[PDB]
Design a protein around this ligand. Structure first.
Ligand SMILES: O=P(O)(O)O[C@H]1O[C@H](CO)[C@@H](O)[C@H]1O
Ligand SMILES: O=P(O)(O)O[C@H]1O[C@H](CO)[C@@H](O)[C@H]1O
Ligand SMILES: O=P(O)(O)O[C@H]1O[C@H](CO)[C@@H](O)[C@H]1O
Lengths: 285, 270, 281
């Protein structure tokens, strides 16, 4: 279970991190599969390997520790999680919750998150951006909600509302920023459903998910968003459609993480630009 | 906690039987903000969970109580302090109290909860008698019964036919109508959201389209255990919120306690 | 329980290889009341799970049965591992990965399922052509945890999980042997169980596009697919799902077993005739 994402352990982590950077992040960023470029476009960046943060959850790419990247992006102080924690890997809820709660204590007000997702909605094209305006947390509706277990009152209430989980204003900004910069056509809003994974969704599953009103499906993001909303961090989340969900069993096309990565590699640049440009126009600061 | 097997349950029940001579025929579980009923129990014996060895324990200030006594002439055991899965309680922990009830002699379990209203015909404060449920966690491999079956209590694969006893439902409705609040009472399908997050509009829309009428984070697990060991079940949701479907878009507590008393009043007796 | 990693799976496969010379190319898993196939295995060696170190235990003890079925080398799991029993992912995964290491190329699985699809009759066979892994979607996918690279990829696709050629072959065999009318193809949804499905659940599952519902199969199929074993799977419809909450009709396990046992011989025949027509090099 790693370390309990309670106030004491989170504070310890936050304070260790604070000793390692003068950057007080206003904006937290989680990069999805193949969506790292943004990470590297951080200016005046301090890079802190997860291995170098005591009690911070560990995730390697393959042997390599993920990184916490502090710096600025469009003149805003950010912390970027380079390497997220997917539940299908077996990570505990505390493992996934901790980094977000650390972000909260560090000063993060807005969490921006990307993921690679399958396009269920038939109108989606590979490489489309689907801003999450809502989600369906299949694991959470089951008994696998990241918040299951004693509530950490320090961070939030027992029964978080997920009413405006995907801040409608952030979404409006994101869309406008896409519109103004010539790629509004790539931008949709929709419902992301979490498949715990790690299997890609069968055609029957995709068909069911689509009929449930899901637009994109992936294996991440919702738990982080839940933790985020729980502790009052505003969320903006986008899915890169990295595969068009196959709805027919009588089909050649088979999802594969490689093509997901390829699609991510191809759209990483535009998504980075989009993110930098959204960040530039974030209010309150 | 401790496996809700016949031996561990037998022990907790035997302890309790040393603490009271009330043999309940009716078990009552009150939901969120309900349970203004535990007050109206006559000649009650309040037994704090803390006092019972191996009994699951509730949650600052308000520790749990097993309230024994009489309601509308009938012997009851009320659970003041309910155990929700989102709290991280084990299957055994949630099953044990229900099986203890069984050993203590409970024949009918009456359950109330606070639920979100999915069905668009529902209004705040409506009562939705459960006539069926969708056990999302159960289908998704978090069925309270997962693990070695405790054969002493019930069969490996319990059917959930008539799980919400139709006769009890008929009676509950008749009593509501006879008491001038029949118009508040609906019947419908309760779906369990493991929680503890409230349901997103997308989730509610999906739940509605799944044929769900109300959603909450309790009840089904207890009901499963009750049905498993042959306890008849009556269960009702107080609609305490009307679910929002699109992102782009005390009074009752005592009425319910009254309703329960009046139902119990009319419950058949051997 | 031991991790279904390559080391543990090898150890088991080797210990089994010390007890039998039969290199199985076909793995068979029998469902509720359907183990009549285990009897038809010729030149057979029966290896109680108990006789296998670190092999999952289930019950009399379960058996790995090695031998010949329609001239093809098979290994049959007499006694499978159901998640509703409390078994770990590793417990379910390991036997399938052991089969992989023993040389299994095709996994044929049966199960007893509730018939959701309203055109299904009791005792029908519904060949699985796809599945809805409700536990899987809900974060109880058997593969959750470190990926075992020796066996498979981190994110297995499940597109042709129910090998369409095996399905075609299964249907032709049924058709030519007089019981094609018994045979359907459909979507199996896993109810984690062990409760039978409520009428509202059944109604929901049906509307989700599910034809049959059971509490097994998907996890082994997923592990099989993950390690590149080809899968054929069939639900025996051992009960017609009750969608009506006012109905007196209800599932009864004794009836489920009876219905399965009644059909086991035909199913055995079918599996044998399928295996007989499997292409061989
Ligand atoms: O969600 P992200 O991290 O982007 O990654 C997604 O893509 C991967 C498989 O394609 C899974 O990890 C899924 O969750
Ligand atoms: O179901 P009861 O016990 O009514 O409580 C319900 O209300 C709480 C949330 O408002 C959750 O615990 C939910 O299950
Ligand atoms: O799937 P098989 O193994 O056939 O068995 C099924 O039959 C039982 C339910 O009747 C459960 O065990 C279910 O999994």
């Amino acid at each position: 279970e790693s370390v309990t994402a309670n106030i004491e352990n989170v504070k310890k982590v936050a304070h260790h991190i604070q000793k390692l950077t003068s950057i007080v992040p206003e904006i937290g960023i989680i990069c999805g599969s193949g969506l790292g470029k943004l990470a590297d476009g951080v200016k005046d960046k301090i890079t802190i390997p997860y291995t170098k943060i005591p009690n911070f959850p560990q995730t390697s790419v393959v042997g390599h520790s993920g990184n916490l990247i502090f710096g600025t992006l469009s003149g805003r102080k950010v912390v970027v999680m380079q390497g997220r924690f997917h539940m299908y890997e077996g990570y505990s809820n505390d493992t996934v919750a901790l980094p977000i709660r650390v972000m909260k204590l560090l000063g993060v007000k807005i969490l921006m998150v990307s993921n690679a997702a399958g396009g269920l909605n038939r109108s989606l094209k590979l490489g489309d951006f689907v801003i999450l305006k809502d989600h369906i947390y299949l694991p959470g509706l089951g008994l696998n909600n990241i918040l299951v277990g004693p509530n950490q009152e320090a961070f939030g209430t027992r029964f978080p509302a997920l009413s405006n989980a995907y801040d409608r204003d952030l979404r409006k900004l994101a869309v406008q920023v896409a519109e103004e910069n010539g790629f509004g056509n790539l931008v949709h809003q929709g419902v992301y459903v979490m498949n715990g994974g790690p299997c890609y969704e069968t055609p029957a599953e995709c068909t069911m998910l689509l009929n449930m009103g899901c637009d994109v499906v992936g294996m991440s993001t919702i738990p982080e968003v839940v933790i985020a909303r729980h502790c009052g961090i505003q969320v903006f989340a986008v899915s890169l459609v990295t595969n068009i969900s196959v709805l027919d069993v009588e089909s050649d096309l088979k999802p594969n993480h490689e093509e997901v990565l390829a699609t991510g590699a191809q759209r990483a640049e535009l998504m980075q630009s989009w993110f930098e440009k959204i960040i530039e126009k974030l209010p309150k600061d």
